[PDB]
Write a protein that binds this ligand. Sequence first.
Ligand SMILES: C[N+](C)(C)C[C@H](O)CC(=O)O
Ligand SMILES: C[N+](C)(C)C[C@H](O)CC(=O)O
Ligand SMILES: C[N+](C)(C)C[C@H](O)CC(=O)O
Ligand SMILES: C[N+](C)(C)C[C@H](O)CC(=O)O
Ligand SMILES: C[N+](C)(C)C[C@H](O)CC(=O)O
Ligand SMILES: C[N+](C)(C)C[C@H](O)CC(=O)O
Ligand SMILES: C[N+](C)(C)C[C@H](O)CC(=O)O
Ligand SMILES: C[N+](C)(C)C[C@H](O)CC(=O)O
Ligand SMILES: C[N+](C)(C)C[C@H](O)CC(=O)O
Ligand SMILES: C[N+](C)(C)C[C@H](O)CC(=O)O
Ligand SMILES: C[N+](C)(C)C[C@H](O)CC(=O)O
Ligand SMILES: C[N+](C)(C)C[C@H](O)CC(=O)O
Ligand SMILES: [Hg+2]
Ligand SMILES: [Hg+2]
Ligand SMILES: [Hg+2]
Ligand SMILES: [Hg+2]
Ligand SMILES: [Hg+2]
Ligand SMILES: [Hg+2]
Ligand SMILES: [Hg+2]
Ligand SMILES: [Hg+2]
Ligand SMILES: [Hg+2]
Ligand SMILES: [Hg+2]
Ligand SMILES: [Hg+2]
Ligand SMILES: [Hg+2]
Ligand SMILES: [Hg+2]
Ligand SMILES: [Hg+2]
Ligand SMILES: [Hg+2]
Ligand SMILES: [Hg+2]
Ligand SMILES: [Hg+2]
Ligand SMILES: [Hg+2]
Ligand SMILES: [Hg+2]
Ligand SMILES: [Hg+2]
Ligand SMILES: [Hg+2]
Ligand SMILES: [Hg+2]
Ligand SMILES: [Hg+2]
Ligand SMILES: [Hg+2]
Ligand SMILES: [Hg+2]
Ligand SMILES: [Hg+2]
Ligand SMILES: [Hg+2]
Lengths: 493, 493, 493
Amino acid sequence: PKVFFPPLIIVGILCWLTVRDLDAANVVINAVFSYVTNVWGWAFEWYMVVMLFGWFWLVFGPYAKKRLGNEPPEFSTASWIFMMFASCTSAAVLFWGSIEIYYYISTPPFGLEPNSTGAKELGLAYSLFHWGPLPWATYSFLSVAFAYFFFVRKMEVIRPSSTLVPLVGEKHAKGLFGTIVDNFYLVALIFAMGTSLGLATPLVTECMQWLFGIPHTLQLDAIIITCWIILNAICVACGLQKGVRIASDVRSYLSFLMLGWVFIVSGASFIMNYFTDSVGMLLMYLPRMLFYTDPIAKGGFPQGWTVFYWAWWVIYAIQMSIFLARISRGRTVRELCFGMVLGLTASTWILWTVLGSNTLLLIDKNIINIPNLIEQYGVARAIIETWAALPLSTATMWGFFILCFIATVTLVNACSYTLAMSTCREVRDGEEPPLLVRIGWSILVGIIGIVLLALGGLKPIQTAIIAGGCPLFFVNIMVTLSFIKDAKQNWKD
Amino acid sequence: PKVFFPPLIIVGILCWLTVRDLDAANVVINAVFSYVTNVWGWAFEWYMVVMLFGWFWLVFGPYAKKRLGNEPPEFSTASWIFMMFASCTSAAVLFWGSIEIYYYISTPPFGLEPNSTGAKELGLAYSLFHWGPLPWATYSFLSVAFAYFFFVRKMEVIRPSSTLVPLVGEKHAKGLFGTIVDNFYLVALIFAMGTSLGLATPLVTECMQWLFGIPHTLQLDAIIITCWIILNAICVACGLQKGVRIASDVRSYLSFLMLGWVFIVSGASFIMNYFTDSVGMLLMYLPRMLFYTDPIAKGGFPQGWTVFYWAWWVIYAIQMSIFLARISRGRTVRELCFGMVLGLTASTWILWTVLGSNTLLLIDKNIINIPNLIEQYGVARAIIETWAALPLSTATMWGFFILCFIATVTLVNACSYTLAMSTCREVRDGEEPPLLVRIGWSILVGIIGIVLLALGGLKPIQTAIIAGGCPLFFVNIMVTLSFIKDAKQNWKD
Amino acid sequence: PKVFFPPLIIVGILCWLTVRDLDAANVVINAVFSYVTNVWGWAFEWYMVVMLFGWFWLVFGPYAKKRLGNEPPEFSTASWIFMMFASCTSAAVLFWGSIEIYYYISTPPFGLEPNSTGAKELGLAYSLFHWGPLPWATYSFLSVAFAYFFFVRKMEVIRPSSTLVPLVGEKHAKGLFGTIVDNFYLVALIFAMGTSLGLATPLVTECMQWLFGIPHTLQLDAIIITCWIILNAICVACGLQKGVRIASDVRSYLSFLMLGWVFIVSGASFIMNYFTDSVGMLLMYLPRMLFYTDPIAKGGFPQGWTVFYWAWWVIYAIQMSIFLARISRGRTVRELCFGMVLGLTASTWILWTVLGSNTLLLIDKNIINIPNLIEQYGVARAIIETWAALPLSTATMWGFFILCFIATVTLVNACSYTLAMSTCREVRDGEEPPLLVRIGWSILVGIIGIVLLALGGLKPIQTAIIAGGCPLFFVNIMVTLSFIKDAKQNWKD
Ligand SMILES: C[N+](C)(C)C[C@H](O)CC(=O)O
Ligand SMILES: C[N+](C)(C)C[C@H](O)CC(=O)O
Ligand SMILES: C[N+](C)(C)C[C@H](O)CC(=O)O
Ligand SMILES: C[N+](C)(C)C[C@H](O)CC(=O)O
Ligand SMILES: C[N+](C)(C)C[C@H](O)CC(=O)O
Ligand SMILES: C[N+](C)(C)C[C@H](O)CC(=O)O
Ligand SMILES: C[N+](C)(C)C[C@H](O)CC(=O)O
Ligand SMILES: C[N+](C)(C)C[C@H](O)CC(=O)O
Ligand SMILES: C[N+](C)(C)C[C@H](O)CC(=O)O
Ligand SMILES: C[N+](C)(C)C[C@H](O)CC(=O)O
Ligand SMILES: C[N+](C)(C)C[C@H](O)CC(=O)O
Ligand SMILES: C[N+](C)(C)C[C@H](O)CC(=O)O
Ligand SMILES: [Hg+2]
Ligand SMILES: [Hg+2]
Ligand SMILES: [Hg+2]
Ligand SMILES: [Hg+2]
Ligand SMILES: [Hg+2]
Ligand SMILES: [Hg+2]
Ligand SMILES: [Hg+2]
Ligand SMILES: [Hg+2]
Ligand SMILES: [Hg+2]
Ligand SMILES: [Hg+2]
Ligand SMILES: [Hg+2]
Ligand SMILES: [Hg+2]
Ligand SMILES: [Hg+2]
Ligand SMILES: [Hg+2]
Ligand SMILES: [Hg+2]
Ligand SMILES: [Hg+2]
Ligand SMILES: [Hg+2]
Ligand SMILES: [Hg+2]
Ligand SMILES: [Hg+2]
Ligand SMILES: [Hg+2]
Ligand SMILES: [Hg+2]
Ligand SMILES: [Hg+2]
Ligand SMILES: [Hg+2]
Ligand SMILES: [Hg+2]
Ligand SMILES: [Hg+2]
Ligand SMILES: [Hg+2]
Ligand SMILES: [Hg+2]
């Protein structure tokens, strides 16, 4: 209703208004980045620092030690920690967990010389930063919030974000404020779903030139994305999880077998060392990476990575918190705070150290002095060469195509559901109306997906997330303030 | 009496014994510095580390959580935190908060190359060190002390420092020990008041060559200082705070408007970044700056700055603690510990980041490649060029002359009062005797003021503080030991 | 019995199987090092990190605050802290506390250039790491264990390590597992006693070419070691501590007088600074040194030092913990945790800063540009030149020969006792059997001693400890797991 159409038009105007002119599009998107980034980047860091302090308070202060709800944990502790370990479902992870370290060593932070021994020493470590405990802790607050809104303050938070900012909401969030926030939210949240898409596709697509060599061309990106949505509409068409249940159970079965594979093959001893050293590098540099900013040098690093990644982390905040909340009925506040960081950091670290060491090795020993060169056709390209360069370069590259495919096939569905529930009747779940609704936003996510690929930079996707979280930085501080002042007076049994 | 004359003569002998020979004076003062500094510098650091650990204990151990006195806080919490934010009343702050960063970038710590990109990266950060939480926490102990001596242990501490070392005082501090400590104290405490003076004057004086261009010459320094004391004697002459009450209320009104001005003009976005980066630099380097010493290199930095600043911080210790104590009736021990650091660090940080960024910008973009050159006539000079180089270079430079003037006019009075109470009848306040007493020490502070300017280095003022705190390092450890062993057995309600 | 012969043969086969071929011996020992080190080094670091976290839990969690036994502390607090300060009894300490800093500055960590100003800046600091609180805290756990096994869980732990792994021991450690662990233990524990020996001798021996110049030759190493065991057998021969009691009381009297000497002479002011700076360097670099690994550079440092030293620390773990446990009857868990680190770190720091500054000074100011050159005959050599170069180069070098002699004379005995009790009747102490047993292992420790010196590297002794702790890393994790799960359910009064 008041949240349905607003996105719809805002995207649409942005679309054939982008599709009309990409040479001019790629100059606005380009200037907004170097605006929001250079001018307001510090805000994004301070945000995460504050949310990080959040985690300490949540752990050591008042509402720690206090049963986040009724008695009974719906899942066992280990089932819980694993439920988190396995929750990663995105393929943009395999993208970034592949070239990230390459970009770190080619343009280092800290004025270290490109490709130097030192540059390489900080590579994995900066992954361990960007994807370790810190960012995962910045979820604890909005988690313990959205979980308190659920199991102690039995006020089931209807999907939109507004349905929980009355406790702060001066101008009743059931009105305009709440609505102009929920679509502000939804818009970035779709753009992000569009950014995952417009990364996950080229990986599958390029994987395809390793299957009797079907080409990659935008057209082919364009075909496989719609080939998604159809296979995903005709998946909703009838009711039975005899496929989509076991799908996820494979996507995680395969991913751990594939990373186990890269781990073992890449050399266990090397990684066990490079990890160890990178921890100490991380710990050493942690305060410097947090507040790493427009140096007087003006290199653009943290601006390019930290600030961009953090916007992204901002966008999927509450979202990931509803999830973490919904699987944590019985837990203490402190339990969640620990459990999630342990569980999530474990899955995220293994990923980037494994895939990213393997990349560093390749770049280092002259085995595919390609990334640098291969950027003369495709980033996405290099990333699969990174897979390619491995033992049994067939069974892997297949494992990589399938795991990479049925990963994004599960993404398209779960976040068209999440996207439908946010514009629907309150009462139950996917009842009578939730139909051509889900199947339509599929088309919408996907069409922004190619829109970006048409523009073809990394910027198009970078600015997309940045502009996204910019708003949702506020939306987040709100949901969390809203939570405190409630809980504040509404606890102390 | 036993504290009046001793200072008087010790200063006097030092005076026309300096005034006889400055070319020989500037060789003793020169050798005592490079004595006390190089040989005993570590002591000053360890001191501050210990006092810093102090703050942790004070916060997490026993006397935390325990009402520092009776029930009722004389001021509200916000009035309290602001009372601290606004308490800065010195102009030597505007001196150091101006050239400090210049000196950091021209002679860096850590063997970084002068003027390099890296040197500049550490500039503000080292201000944030020297003037952030750490040094301000090293006050908490002597605060919670002098505040305990007041509101739980109703034993109103008569102005001299001795009147509270019997609880430790083996050879009753009411005797000789106590007395030879109170003038040892008073002597450095005046020398310091003399050092503030002999910095605050040239700022006003040079500001004056921006007022139809009245010269600066020592003579003119000499005239304006006595022009102080007269305007300050004839201020005591009759009783009414229809001027000296509203004076302070202006000096703080103007300073925040002037720093707000420099902030906005200098570029908000730049500063917000340079601050952010400098925090992370500070946090990164904090353990290294604390214990930063005579490297094997023997560069002289920490020796020159850290050790000198810390002596200064040592001197105005108890003094600033009586003050902080006297405004904190109702507070908890932990409250004070937090409140003061927050409140004080807030005011101190804003200052040095604002004024000091503005300086770095100027030095950086070739806009006044002067500091280096302008040192061929005046440091004090450069500092106002730093003001000068700003938009509406008239309204500012006036704002800077006035704020800089009526700042030191309030300094001369408040610390001639503090200087009079320390040599007076116990009973009440400024009763019958406190008259020609206050007006005389005015003359004494001021005359040491020019004495230094006659010698004209930064050393004269540097060694002055160093030699000062050297003693008072002990005097401090005393007042604080004295406090513990009392409180120790004299608490646990 | 089941622990007596197994060592005996395992050493013996290793002996004339080494003594047959040193040119081939020095190629296996050489390859096992660069195996265990390069491939499994991280394990040794993680171990110490875990044990370091151990100390936090032991201090802040459950069994803190809880009387480690009955009421009465057998020794006073100060007697206790000193008992720890003085417990150092090894001469390999004077070896490492002598050339360590030289090796740090000649091959630095972190890619700093050999002999550079920066290299020297990190020298002492890396000693403060390797021999400060961290490693000493990694004892707290096995201490609080072995002390709990004693005074709350009155189950006097018969000397072998197995006699306390039933609480974990699945396949009853009274059987084979326990036995094949106790000799696995004993073997490394002797090898280590052999490594102390094969370092302590050349120090005494070279000290001897400063006594009308008796030569040093292996033969002479070989003679003085047996001259040990005889003087040590004929020490057991009859019963009276009219010599061996007052021996220790001298060895510690002399060592503190000798280090007091080097301290004062070397320049108090310099050291007080170099210490101070090195603390801040240590604190700064601490997370980096902990996890310092096979860089991508592959320099071999941490591999060479950290990993080797840590193996050593692993070997003398439980051993040093039985000791620390046995002197801490009345103490709280937290008490021990603090007491030991304070006490032990105090003795260890003073040592390496004093001896190691003195070395740096010598290397620095061109006063004995010898270490580099003198390695063309003896490391052991250089180390005494380091003593030699001092004021009253006779009274010292004598003090160094005697303190260095009667230090190792006490070592040979105390750890042939410890070595005998581990293969003996349970009931009392040195009863009827404990005789030709102690005197025999003397011969065994000593013969491995020269075996190493015959091979003559630092590697022979380095790999000896490495291979040692490799096993005992496990043996340690065991004794400590075993302890938790007992205490776990067997506490909570
Ligand atoms: C990471 N990367 C290379 C995409 C962006 C850079 O960090 C910023 C830049 O290119 O200057
Ligand atoms: C999709 N991905 C993981 C790359 C971006 C988001 O940060 C995911 C997340 O952190 O939960
Ligand atoms: C990252 N994203 C949005 C793809 C997935 C959600 O954040 C978490 C989920 O849907 O389980
Ligand atoms: C995670 N989620 C919501 C999909 C499944 C439920 O949490 C499990 C349940 O409600 O029993
Ligand atoms: C800061 N300054 C330049 C005044 C003193 C220096 O740090 C010491 C020096 O000049 O060597
Ligand atoms: C006058 N000033 C501020 C420069 C030196 C003292 O350190 C002031 C203070 O710290 O309270
Ligand atoms: C710094 N000084 C001495 C100028 C002022 C006092 O320390 C504080 C005060 O008088 O309020
Ligand atoms: C700060 N001081 C002492 C000047 C004013 C008083 O604290 C206020 C009062 O005593 O009511
Ligand atoms: C310390 N030392 C020199 C014995 C071993 C080195 O660290 C390793 C090496 O020689 O490469
Ligand atoms: C003999 N020494 C001290 C050199 C090696 C061991 O580490 C000693 C110890 O740490 O207890
Ligand atoms: C280091 N070592 C084994 C020589 C001595 C023991 O560890 C401690 C002791 O016997 O007191
Ligand atoms: C340290 N040790 C065991 C040698 C002596 C005893 O602890 C002292 C005692 O048992 O009275
Ligand atoms: Hg679009
Ligand atoms: Hg994934
Ligand atoms: Hg998506
Ligand atoms: Hg793929
Ligand atoms: Hg399909
Ligand atoms: Hg169907
Ligand atoms: Hg399904
Ligand atoms: Hg999603
Ligand atoms: Hg923003
Ligand atoms: Hg003077
Ligand atoms: Hg001020
Ligand atoms: Hg003054
Ligand atoms: Hg002025
Ligand atoms: Hg005047
Ligand atoms: Hg008057
Ligand atoms: Hg007045
Ligand atoms: Hg004052
Ligand atoms: Hg001093
Ligand atoms: Hg041997
Ligand atoms: Hg020793
Ligand atoms: Hg031994
Ligand atoms: Hg010796
Ligand atoms: Hg002998
Ligand atoms: Hg005998
Ligand atoms: Hg004896
Ligand atoms: Hg021993
Ligand atoms: Hg091992």
